[PDB]
C-alpha cells in the first residue's frame, strides 16, 4: 500500500514539480516546504541511484523535456522528420509545462489551439500595474476588424483589478463562483510571447429564459436587484418578464431514484411526442455516478413495451 | 522485469488480480445513435439540444475526496492544480452553456423512510 | 379493472370403486391440505433448505421425535437400550460425549416412565 | 449424511480443535460407500452406521 | 444555575448549556455559528474571525446533519442581504446589527464564506474519526482501503462456537453435568452475554485467580464440602437443642436425613437442612461444636462455576473475533472509535493531538446524551486543557432513552463537575401556559425527584406570543391534565388493558363524533378549527400491549394505523410466494414444482382454471417458452428487466387494484424487487441470489431497509407509536394509559458512585442489586418526563394501584416502587386510603380527575 501511494505521488511530482526533483538529484533540500520531505528526498535519491546501478536507462520526463526545449531554442527552421500541420481542440486544462513545450514548438511548426470560454471580454487576474499596460494591445477578427475589452481605460485602471488578486467586480456571481479553473487557465494562456490570437463569437438573442441566462453570462452584466433604496425595493416591474407557459428551464423533485428515472422517461416521451422535429440523436442525459444508477435505466428501458419503445 | 528477488504470499497476487480484472471498462458505444447515458465525462464539451441531469442533492455533488494526508503540493498551491471539486464546478458551468434549446435538472427532496427533509446542492 | 374471482368452484368428479385405508387416513388428517395435494396434484412445498452450519448441539423437532419413537418401540419389547445407543452414536446425531450421555439418561427415564403404564396391560 | 465441517483430520487439527473424527467429508464418503456395500439394519462396523439410500446404479456420483 | 443571553455568551474555556425540551435547540446553535463566523462580541468573543472550513459540528443522525446544514444555508443567505439593506423585519438580526462596525466588510466576508458551504465540516461521529485517521495515517496505523462491514453477529456466534468446542469438550461427565444444568449450548450461552461484549469491556467485581483451571476449582469445591460431610457424622448424635413447640419435629427428621446425606461425593446441591445449622440461625431461633462455625462460613458465600466460566469466555471471544477481522482485512464502526482511543492514549500521538487542535480550533457537540466514555476521554484529553481554544456543549440532561443502544448518563454526570459555567433556556414557543404550569407543578412535591443531586430542578417559563391557546369542548372550556383513577383495591394494569382500555377509545370516539358535529373546537385567539379524526394519538411502552389496545379501538369501529411497525417485510406471505415464483423460473421443466407459482394468490387463477390446464398438453406447452424467455432475460440483463416484464405481461397490477385492498399488498412486491438490486450488485453468482433470499427469510433482522412504507396521507387514523420512536414531533392530543405499571430488573449491573465505571458483579449481592435497581427507577421517571413533552393543548393519562402480592386486603401498595407512585406518595409507602385524599388534595383548576367508568357510552 505504501509503495503504491509513493509511486502515485512521485508520478504527480514528476508531472508537476520538476525543480524539486532537480534539487533532490543534487541532494540539497528546498526551503519553505512542510513536513515529510526529510524522508521523501533520500528515498528518491536512492531510487535514482539504484536504477542507475541496475543498468536501466536514465532518461525520464523532467530532464527529457528540459533538454527538448533547450535544443529546440537553437536550431534551424525545422529538423527533418516532423508533422507539418496539426490541429488541437477540446482543451481546457493541461500542466503549464505542456504549454511551455508548445511555445517552444510553435516557432518551427504550425499549430492551432481551439480554446473555449463562456465569455468574450477579458476576465482573468492581474499581477502588477505594469502587466495590464502590456495587455492593452489589439486582438483581431478572422477577416476584417479588431476588438478589445470594453471601455478601454477607465474600468481596468479603475478599481476593477484590485491590487493583488483579479477582478473584484466580475459581476455575474455564476462566473465569479464557478470559473476558478477557467480564470487561472486563461491567465496562464495570456502570458506568452509568440501568442497571436483572434476569435469568432456568435451572439445570442434573448427570447427564452435560457437565452437570457446565456446573454447575461456572455456580456458580463448583472441583472440582480438587491433593493437598496425604498423606491427600488417597492417597484418590481423593472426586471425582464417571462411568459407563464414557458418550460425552457424546469425542475422536478421526486422521492426515489426509480421514480426519478420514470419521471424523466415520461417527460422525455411527452416532449418527443409534442415536438415533431426532434431526433433522438440529440438528447443526452448525464448522471452523477453510473454504477449506482444503471440498473434502473436497464429496468425502464427493458420493461418499456414495443409500441412506443425508444432505443437507448 | 522490475527484478525482485524474494518470495511472496498468495494474498498479494489474489487481490491484485481481483483489482486488475475489475479495472477494465467499455467506452465503445457513446455515439450509437439513440439516447446516450453516461457519466459527467471530464474534459468534454459538445453542443446538444436537450441536456438532463440526475442526483444534485447535498453531499453527493460535487465529490468530496480527502487528500492523502501528507501531500506536498496540497500545502503550496500553484496555477496548474486540478482538484476534483473545481473540476466538477467547472463542468457544471460548461454543461449549462452547452445547452441549446431546453434544460432539465432534478434532485431528491423527501426521504422515503420517514418523510424527513433533504436539500439540493449549492449550484442549483 | 375486474376483481379476482373466488377460488372455490364446483368440480366434476366420479367416485372410484376401491379406496385404500391409508388414503382415507391421509385425507382425514387435514382435508384442505389433502384437497390441494392429491386432487389437482399441487403442493406448496417449503423448498429444500440449506445445510445447517454445524453439528447439532441440541435436539428438537423431528430430529428428536423419531429418536423418542425408536426408543419407546425398543423399550416396549424390554430389550437392551445400550445397543441402540451405540447405533445412534455411530450414526452421528448425538452431542459429543457427556452431553449426549446425559441427554440419553433423561430421555430413557421419561420413555421408561411412559413404558411402565404401557406394558402394564400388554 | 451430516457433513458440515472441513475436509480431514489434518484440517481439523491445524486450527487447534479437538479431533472429533466426525462430520467431515472423509467420514461422510466412508459412510456412503459402506452403505453401498451393505444394508443399514445389520449393524455398525467401525462405529460408522451405513447409509441406506445409495445402492442402485446411481453410485458413480460418489 | 443562571439563564443565558445568546449574544452575551463568552466563548472561552468550557461552556455547558443545559437545555430542556421545548426550547428550539436548532434555533440556538445557528445564532452562535453566525456570531462566531464573523467574530462579534467585543470583550466576550474569539480573538480572530474564522472561515467556515475551521468549524466542527458533531451530530448523531444524518437526518439532523442535512437539516442543520440547510438551516445555516438559509440563515447566511438572509443575513447577508439584510446587511446590505440595513433594515430587517426580524428582531434577532435587528439586535445583531448593533455590533456590526463595517457594513461593507461583512458583505464581502459572508459572500466569500457562502461559496465554500458545500464542504463545511459538519460530520457524524464515525465519519469524523475515519477522516482524521485517513489524514493522519502513519502514527495511527490505518490501511488505505477498508472493506466495510456492519454485521457483527455471525462472526460473534461462529467464534463463540470454537470456544465452546475447545473449552467444554474434554471435561469428565461428573464435572460437565453442572455446566450442562445452567445452559445447554453456545446459542443459549450467547443470548445472556451478548450485551456485555459490545462496546467497552466492563470491569468485573471479585475476579477469580488467573490460573485456577476448571478441574482445580471443581476439586477445590469438592474438598471444601468434603471436611463438613466427613465431620458431620460426629456432630449428629446428641440432643444439643431443646425440643419444644418452637422445636419442630421436622428438624429431627432433617438430621435424620442428614445421616443419609452423608452418602457420596458427586452430589452437588446441598440440602436446605444446613441453613438451620448455623450459630447465626439456631441461637436466635452456644458454639456447640468447633465445626458448627464452619458451616456458617460456607453458607454465607455461595458456590458455582458460572463466574469463572463467564470470565474465561469474555476476553477470549473478543480477542478471537478481533484477530479474525484483522486477518481478513475489515474494520467496524464500533471498532474505529477504540482504534482512535488507543492511539490518543499512547504517547506516540502527541503530535497528532497538536495537529488536530491546530486544524480545528473549536468544538461543539449535538445533544450530548449519547456521550460514550470512549468519546468523553478523547474530548477531555484534547480540549479540557490547552487553552485559547474553546469548546461548547449543548445538552438535554434528562430523557436518556438510548441506554439499550449504549448511551450512558454517568459520563454526563462526571462531565458536569469539571465544567464551570451553566446556562438554561426557558421559552417554550410550543404549548399552553396551563401545560407549562402542569409540568412545573407536578415536580414540586419533593426535591431531587430522580434520586440524583447532579441533575437540577425544572423551572420552565411559557412563551408570550401564544399565551392564549385554549381547547374548548361542549360549551365550557377544558383544563390541561385529566387523570383517570381506578376503582378498587388491588387490580392489575392487565385489568385495565382488558376492560378499561376501551374507556380511552370511547372518549376518543366521543371527541371525533363531537368534532365532526361542531361541538368540540380547536382554537387560538378567536379563530377556530374543528377536531379532525387524525391528530389524536396514544402512546404505549412495549409492543405487546399494542394488541391489548387495538381490540379496544376496533370494537368501537375506528380503524387504527400503526407507526411502531418494526415487522420486517420478509415475514409476510408475499416473500414466501415470491421465492416460489422466482425459483419456478430457475426450474422451468420440473412439472411438480412449476405448478407452485400458478396456484398462488398473487397469480390469481381458480380451481377450474388449473383443472383444464392439467389435462391439456398444449396449454401446458404455451407457458414453457414464456418462462424460457424470462430465464434468458434474467441471464442477460438482471432481476429488474426479468421481473418487471412479468409484472407488465400478465396484467396483474390493475387487476389487484379492483380487489379489496390489493394496493396494500402491491407495495411489498416493489419493495422486495428494490432490495434484490442492491443484493445483486454485491453478489455476482446468479444462482446464489436464491440462497441469499432463503437465508434472509429465516432470521427476521430489524434493520433499516427491511421495514415497510406508509400508504395514505390524504386522511390519517389514530396513530400508535412507541416512546423511542416519538422524538421531536408535535402532537395536539395524546393518551398515556398504561404509564403506571413497572418491571423490576434482576441482573446485577450498576455504576459506582465515585469511579463511574461499569463495575460488574456476576454474583447476587443484594447491596449491588439495590444500586442496580435505583437506576431502573430513575430511567422510568426520565421516560415519564419524555411522555410529557407532547400534547400542545390537552394531555390525559390513567393510573392503577397494583399490589405485587396476589392478595388484596393488606393495607399497602407497590406503586411507590414504580415511577409515578413514588413521586405521588412523597417517598413513603401508603395505601388506597392514604392515596385517595392525596390525589384530590392538589387538584386546583388543572387536574380534572374522574373515577373509573365500567360502561360503554357509544
Curated annotation (Swiss-Prot), chain B:
Free-text note regarding domains: The holoenzyme may undergo conformational shifts upon DNA binding: the nuclease domain of RecB may swing away from the DNA exit tunnel in RecC. When Chi DNA binds to the RecC tunnel, the nuclease domain may then swing back to its original position (that seen in crystal structures), allowing it to nick the DNA 3' of the Chi site and then rotate to load RecA. At high Mg(2+) the nuclease domain may swing back more frequently, explaining differences seen in assays performed at high Mg(2+).
Describe which stretch of the whole protein the shown chain covers, with first residue, last residue and complete length.
625 to 748 of 1122
Assembly and partners? Heterotrimer of RecB, RecC and RecD. All subunits contribute to DNA-binding. Interacts with YgbT (Cas1). (Microbial infection) Lambda virus GamS protein interacts with the enzyme without displacing any of the subunits.
Instruction: Identify its protein family.
Output: Belongs to the RecC family.
Return the protein name: RecBCD enzyme subunit RecC
Gene designation:
recC
Quote the annotated effect of residue 81 to A/H. Answer: Acts at variant Chi sequences
Further remarks about this protein from its record? In the RecBCD complex, RecB has a slow 3'-5' helicase, an exonuclease activity and loads RecA onto ssDNA, RecD has a fast 5'-3' helicase activity while RecC stimulates the ATPase and processivity of the RecB helicase and contributes to recognition of the Chi site.
Q: What happens when the gene is disrupted?
A: Decreased degradation of DNA with free ends that is unable to undergo homologous recombination, which can fortuitously lead to more efficient viral infection. Cells are deficient in DNA recombination repair and have increased sensitivity to UV light. The cultures have many inviable cells. Cells can be transformed with retron Ec48-containing plasmids.
User: Species name for this entry?
Assistant: Escherichia coli (strain K12)
From Swiss-Prot, chain C:
Q: Which domain of life is it from?
A: Bacteria
What did gene disruption experiments reveal? Answer: Decreased degradation of DNA with free ends that is unable to undergo homologous recombination, which can fortuitously lead to more efficient viral infection. Cells are deficient in DNA recombination repair and have increased sensitivity to UV light. The cultures have many inviable cells. Cells can be transformed with retron Ec48-containing plasmids.
| UniProt record similarity statement | Belongs to the RecC family.
Q: Kindly give any further remark recorded in the entry.
A: In the RecBCD complex, RecB has a slow 3'-5' helicase, an exonuclease activity and loads RecA onto ssDNA, RecD has a fast 5'-3' helicase activity while RecC stimulates the ATPase and processivity of the RecB helicase and contributes to recognition of the Chi site.
Q: Whom does it interact with, and what assembly results?
A: Heterotrimer of RecB, RecC and RecD. All subunits contribute to DNA-binding. Interacts with YgbT (Cas1). (Microbial infection) Lambda virus GamS protein interacts with the enzyme without displacing any of the subunits.
Q: What is known of its domains?
A: The holoenzyme may undergo conformational shifts upon DNA binding: the nuclease domain of RecB may swing away from the DNA exit tunnel in RecC. When Chi DNA binds to the RecC tunnel, the nuclease domain may then swing back to its original position (that seen in crystal structures), allowing it to nick the DNA 3' of the Chi site and then rotate to load RecA. At high Mg(2+) the nuclease domain may swing back more frequently, explaining differences seen in assays performed at high Mg(2+).
Annotated protein name in UniProt: RecBCD enzyme subunit RecC
Q: Which organism is it from?
A: Escherichia coli (strain K12)
Q: What is the lineage of its organism?
A: Bacteria, Pseudomonadati, Pseudomonadota, Gammaproteobacteria, Enterobacterales
> Gene symbol?
recC
Q: State start and end of the fragment within the whole protein.
A: 814 to 935 of 1122
From Swiss-Prot, chain E:
Annotated region of DNA binding: 248-250, 493-494, 542-543, 743
Entry EC no(s) = 3.1.11.5, 5.6.2.4
Can you quote the record's cofactor note?
Binds 1 Mg(2+) ion per subunit. Magnesium is required for both helicase and nuclease activity; its relative concentration alters helicase speed and nuclease activity in a complicated fashion.
Entry cofactors: Mg(2+)
Does the entry feature the keyword ATP-binding, yes or no? Answer: yes
Write out the entry's keywords from A to Z.
ATP-binding, DNA damage, DNA repair, DNA-binding, Exonuclease, Helicase, Hydrolase, Isomerase, Magnesium, Metal-binding, Nuclease, Nucleotide-binding
According to the record's subunit comment, the protein's assembly and interactions are:
Heterotrimer of RecB, RecC and RecD. All subunits contribute to DNA-binding. The C-terminus interacts with RecA. Interacts with YgbT (Cas1).
Q: What is the recorded name of this protein?
A: RecBCD enzyme subunit RecB
Q: Which organism is it from?
A: Escherichia coli (strain K12)
Q: What is the lineage of its organism?
A: Bacteria, Pseudomonadati, Pseudomonadota, Gammaproteobacteria, Enterobacterales
Which part of the complete sequence is present?
5 to 876 of 1180
